[PDB]
Structure 1
Amino acid sequence: MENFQKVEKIGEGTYGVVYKARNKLTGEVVALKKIVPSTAIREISLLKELNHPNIVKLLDVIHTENKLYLVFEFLHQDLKKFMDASALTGIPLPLIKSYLFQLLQGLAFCHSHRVLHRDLKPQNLLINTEGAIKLADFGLARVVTLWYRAPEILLGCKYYSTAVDIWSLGCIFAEMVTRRALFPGDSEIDQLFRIFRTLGTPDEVVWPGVTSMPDYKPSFPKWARQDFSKVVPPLDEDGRSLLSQMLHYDPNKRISAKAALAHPFFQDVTKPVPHLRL
């Protein structure tokens, strides 16, 4: 640690405080996360090899004094701040599409290595001046916001898979378009019920096996599904079709990152430069 000079606190991650810091040696500016079980050390070590342009690079892992520090590449802004900053005007559709495409490329990569994020949220999607967007805190999982949590997690599924990340990204996609959180639940049941109220209460017809799930209750209220035209106006039909697929109840039916990349929505994708005030 003596090799780093703390510049400032850039948030309070789920595991510890994250600091912008300077390598007293190389002079490199990095993000320093202060989080040990051998399993954790080994798992984290694996993440160091998981390199991709849309994944925040984990530079080094430092274990000392039974303490654990993760040194990451530093990015100046996150999607939440950018969304807040662009609230009056909204993020231009072409930039939303570019960001969604890049994130799907990142997910496609991680997923192909059997690595899940599990906690995707605007705060952990980092952006730069070049129009790039990157997933932060990938593989780390293996008040905390429930807004992006997939229904199978909320329903007590113990062995959920990659589809949970597609669900979270579908929620974030909707939020970028509408400028309002899709399902801002403030408790597990409120989260579940917000999802039901919009997509309809799931049943054996649309989600075979849902009624047997651990936290499923026959006493759940039965709400009708709403039309996406009401959910994310004025997103075009291509966008709404993609969204509807990323939000399928059945994790097995939910579109994969790979398939999502081929969706017609991305036929005209480009890479705009955002306007960032750093």
Structure 2
Amino acid sequence: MENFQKVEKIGEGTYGVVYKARNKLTGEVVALKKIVPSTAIREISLLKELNHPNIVKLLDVIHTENKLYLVFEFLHQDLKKFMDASALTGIPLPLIKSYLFQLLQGLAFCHSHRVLHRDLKPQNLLINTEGAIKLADFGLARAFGVPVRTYTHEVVTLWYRAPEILLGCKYYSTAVDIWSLGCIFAEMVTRRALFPGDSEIDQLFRIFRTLGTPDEVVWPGVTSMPDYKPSFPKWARQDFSKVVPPLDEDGRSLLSQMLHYDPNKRISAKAALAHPFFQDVTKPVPHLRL
């Protein structure tokens, strides 16, 4: 750590404080995350090889005095702040489309290597002046797990959690990230969180109220999931036309596939990239005020 000079604290992550820092040597500006079980060391070490333009680069891993520091590429802003800043007029569709496309590219890459994010949310989607967007903290969940509360006791958001996780599925897979990204896509379009649950049951019920209570017809095997209860209220499904107006038919079709209840039926990142919604994708420059 003596090799770095802390510039400023940029936030409190799930596992620890996040700092903007400067390599006292190379002069490189980086993000320093303060987080050891050999299991974690090896898993994190594998992440250093998982490189892609839409994944925040993990530069180095520092284990000292039984402490763990992850050194990452630094990005100036996250999607949460950007969305808050674009609240008045909303993010232009072409930019939404570009961001979704890039994020799907990142997902396609990680998933192809059987690596899941598991905790996608606007806070960990980082952007730059060049119009790029990248997934941050990829793989840390499997490495350190996902706590209910952060090291600061802050509540970990459930808003983007897939239903199979909420229902107690132990071996969920890559489809969980597609669900999360679908929720984020909807949020960018509407300027409001899709399912802002404040408890596991409230999260589940919010999903049910919109997409309908899942049954054996739409999701074979659902009634057998660990946390499924026959006593769940039975709500009818809403038209996406009512959910994400005024997203066009192509966008609504794509969103519907990313939000399929059955994880096996949910669209993959790779297939999503081929959806007609991206026929006219471009790469606009966002207006960032740093």
Pair in the same fold by TM > 0.5? yes
CA drift of 1:77 comes to 0.2
CA drift of 1:242 comes to 0.1
CA drift of 1:269 comes to 0.0
CA drift of 1:57 comes to 0.1
CA drift of 1:150 comes to 0.1
| Per-residue Cα deviation, 1:90-110 (whole angstroms, up to 9, x for no partner) | 000000000000000000000
Q: Secondary structure at the match of 1:6?
A: strand
Q: Which residue of 2 aligns with 1:241?
A: 253
CA drift of 1:35 comes to 0.0
Distance 1:8 1:184 in 2: 30
CA drift of 1:162 comes to 0.1
Q: Which residue of 2 aligns with 1:155?
A: 167
Q: Secondary structure at the match of 1:268?
A: coil
CA drift of 1:70 comes to 0.1
Q: Is it true that 1:258 corresponds to 2:270 in the alignment?
A: yes
CA drift of 1:38 comes to 0.3
Unaligned runs of 5+ in 2: 143-154
Q: Is it true that 1:137 corresponds to 2:134 in the alignment?
A: no
Distance 2:182 2:189 in 1: 11
CA drift of 1:137 comes to 0.2
Unaligned runs of 5+ in 1: none
Cα RMSD of the aligned pairs, angstroms, is 0.2
CA drift of 1:54 comes to 0.1
CA drift of 1:183 comes to 0.1
Distance 2:128 2:94 in 1: 16
Q: Secondary structure at the match of 2:187?
A: helix
Distance 1:10 1:118 in 2: 22
| Per-residue Cα deviation, 1:105-124 (whole angstroms, up to 9, x for no partner) | 00000000000000000000
| Per-residue Cα deviation, 1:33-65 (whole angstroms, up to 9, x for no partner) | 000000100000000000000000000000000
Distance 2:86 2:110 in 1: 29
Q: Which residue of 2 aligns with 1:17?
A: 17
CA drift of 1:190 comes to 0.1
| Per-residue Cα deviation, 1:124-177 (whole angstroms, up to 9, x for no partner) | 000000000000000000000000000000000000000000000000000000
Match 2:279 to one of 267, 273, 278: 267
Q: Secondary structure at the match of 2:207?
A: helix
CA drift of 1:16 comes to 0.5
CA drift of 1:203 comes to 0.0
CA drift of 1:199 comes to 0.1
Distance 1:25 1:147 in 2: 41
Number of residue pairs aligned between Structure 1 and Structure 2: 278
Matches within 5 A, 1:199-218: 199-218=211-230
CA drift of 1:84 comes to 0.2
| Per-residue Cα deviation, 1:66-88 (whole angstroms, up to 9, x for no partner) | 00000000000000000000000
Matches within 5 A, 1:180-219: 180-219=192-231
Matches within 5 A, 1:66-77: 66-77=66-77
Matches within 5 A, 1:227-238: 227-238=239-250
Distance 1:119 1:12 in 2: 15
